[PDB]
Symmetry: D2
Subunit: 125 residues, 4 copies
């Protein structure tokens, strides 16, 4: 089993009020659903990702990332977000991320295809 498998598995919330539901597998897999409180999104979207299942023991965080394509049974926003970050355990566990949101564009609009931002996830709120 992964070092932080139990620490990562569960329900997380970011500063926007979005809900990140994830299961960390012993093999390094991340699976679950994402519900965004903002943007062209409603209800849950499939997510998949990976995490370091044997992290350093020097107090460093645990690197991880995941992807949502913004298509479900309700809506298709023709776009995908990837979150890249690290899990930090302890009393106030956190997943600190930066993200890249790419829209499908024509080639003439490709220069403005990608948004960047940062989300912090906690176990509360």
């Amino acid at each position: 089993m992964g070092r932080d498998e139990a620490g990562i598995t569960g329900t997380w919330y970011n500063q926007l009020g979005s809900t990140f539901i994830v299961t960390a597998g012993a093999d390094g897999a991340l699976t679950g659903t994402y519900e965004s409180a903002v943007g062209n999104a409603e209800s849950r979207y499939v997510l998949t990702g990976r995490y370091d299942s044997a992290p350093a023991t020097d107090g460093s965080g645990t690197a991880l990332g995941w992807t949502v394509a913004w298509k479900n049974n309700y809506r298709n926003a023709h776009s995908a977000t990837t979150w890249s970050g690290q899990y930090v355990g302890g009393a106030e566990a956190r997943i600190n991320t930066q993200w890249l949101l790419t829209c499908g564009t024509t080639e003439a609009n490709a220069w403005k295809s990608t948004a960047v931002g940062h989300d912090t996830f906690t176990k509360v709120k």
Copy 2:
């Protein structure tokens, strides 16, 4: 089946000489392996991601993303990369991406945890 399921599935190469082997599923899943020609990496790493399986028909690209955690049977670089981008079909098919590489760090080093860059993948080279 996804609109670009056949277009995306296969072997891709980026400008560094890295090899991206991916299968696009009818459900929007991306699965496969990544081999980086640079950095603290050797041989293949598991990847997983998502793509828009019903993209726009106005000539826009197909949004997608995937994650590699840099742990395999040979090495563990305690880090993860996410690629966010779009697939562009046609004679010279391309996957144009930007990426975020996060290292697990102490909190004192978290400000410098994340590298950003851009990779273009083609079916040749």
Copy 3:
């Protein structure tokens, strides 16, 4: 004079304890000094940048950016950071930024030349 010339001019502090001293000119110029609490840096570095001197009046923030090259009389870290963001006035004024730190590299190391992060500046601390 710029709409937020007086709001922006002054001393700001980010979450790392770095000090951003800036003067906003009527013409859209930003001038001043930056002192980083972290990294290969000591004492003050020259900065220059630009801001929107006639922002929207619909409650939107004021877009701005600036650059530091990490060379002064004490040290040269062969690198430059740019901050891109917006000023938000009011009781708890803030400058919310994302930044790109590029190191001079050989071409073989150029893929890992750039760090990305986010700093929030306030008038206190």
Copy 4:
């Protein structure tokens, strides 16, 4: 005078057809004008930035960055772009950059305030 003062000073063009006119000062300053071939922009905009005026001599590039606020006498797009990158001299001199474009937004739209991309500048085209 800066090591690459003469190498950097002049007219540059990126892959979009935008024109970057810059003067590198002996003190590390960058001054000039930017004309974007795309987006909410017409004619020239003021730019200012900084570069490493005493770079490494091991073949590494020269770190630099600059800012444009997208306001001039013709238009105001209430936004600013910062380019962060490095100058690479030689027969085919290049300035390789990544950039952050921030729009002034309401707080409700701040999550989508920032675009990210990459521009390569050459002395031809």
